[PDB]
């Protein structure tokens, strides 16, 4: 009886932990894609800034 109830509680805990893991993994993947985008964009800003400063000179 005790092991059965403990199994139910442990298994429901597993389901919620797995669901949170899937949620947060998808969020992490989206955030990684977005920060890749922002990093490359910052790089773009840098080259264009360099071009502007040489042209001005």
């Amino acid at each position: 009886d005790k092991y059965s109830e403990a199994l139910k509680d442990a298994q429901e805990k597993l389901e919620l932990a797995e669901k949170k893991a899937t949620d947060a993994e998808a969020d992490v993947a989206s955030l990684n894609r977005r920060i890749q985008l922002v990093e490359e964009e910052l790089d773009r800003a840098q080259e264009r800034l360099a071009t502007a400063l040489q042209k001005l000179e």
Partner: protein
């Protein structure tokens, strides 16, 4: 002498003026236009294509 000088300088000024006419016609429409890279910050991170 003045006639010789006038004739020479008049021919020179005639060629000079014909040369100016081309510049008078257009002066800026020969250069290309501006298309510098900038902004784009609002674009999304998960590109609709997998080159993301």
């Amino acid at each position: 002498l003045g006639a010789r000088a006038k004739e020479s300088l008049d021919l020179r000024a005639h060629l000079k003026q014909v040369k100016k006419e081309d510049t008078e016609k257009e002066n800026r429409e020969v250069g290309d236009w501006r298309k510098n890279i900038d902004a784009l910050s609002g674009m999304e991170g998960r590109k609709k294509k997998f080159e993301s």
